[PDB]
Amino acid sequence: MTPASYNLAVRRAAPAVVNVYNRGLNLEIRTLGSGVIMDQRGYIITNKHVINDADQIIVALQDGRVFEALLVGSDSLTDLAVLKINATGGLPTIPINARRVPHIGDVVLAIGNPYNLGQTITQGIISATGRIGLNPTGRQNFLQTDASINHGNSGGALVNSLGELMGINTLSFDKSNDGETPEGIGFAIPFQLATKIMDKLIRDGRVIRGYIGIIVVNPDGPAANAGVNDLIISVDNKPAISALETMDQVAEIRPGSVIPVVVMTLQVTIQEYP
């Protein structure tokens, strides 16, 4: 017999996870975290809060290479950031299977640099999917995991036993108002959302969202200027059945774009989310 092991996932995915250093003038490491190399061009996902207000951003590979990284862009709403470094040599890249559907109870591995001890792998499962996270106000989708996450793990990889990316570790549940200590409660941005946000950031240098300042309707907004208690049955020639699916459609639409909003036909001009 051989020892039960997830070293295969480790060999495949770990080389693609990097140490990220946020340096600020005082230069001195103001904070640190992790990042994932997404493809050969040198694009790297990480968390925004890791690279916020950095004067210089450093990336380090497990193979020893170090790089000054360029901030391509970031998104507060998803707390995601994209970096760029230029490598003549090949780069390690994270295995991605865009067809893989993460399931509750899938074994996962958290790859990151906890407390700057050097790269660490930890093992758990997918505790839950579709979680708003720590903030009820925040309307996001998170994978939940009991793989041990610590300071230094943010921006790093969460992978299944095959080494495929399942998410980006964002944060651990560390707090209660009471001060009770949570155990095994950690969150990651789902990889499909992280990929969509990365592509947006690469293209526009920021996430450009549609805003329409508003299905039953409950200032100076696109809607207000187009012309309460109104019933929107169709938005941009798409049946408004669910309010969640529509607000996602709005987001997608590019600012400056004019669409027909049927209500029981107004011409609205989409604008950027403030």
Binding site: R139, G210, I212, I214, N218, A243, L244, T246, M247, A251
Partner: peptide, 4 residues
């Protein structure tokens, strides 16, 4: 119920 949302805002968008």
């Amino acid at each position: 119920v949302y805002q968008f």
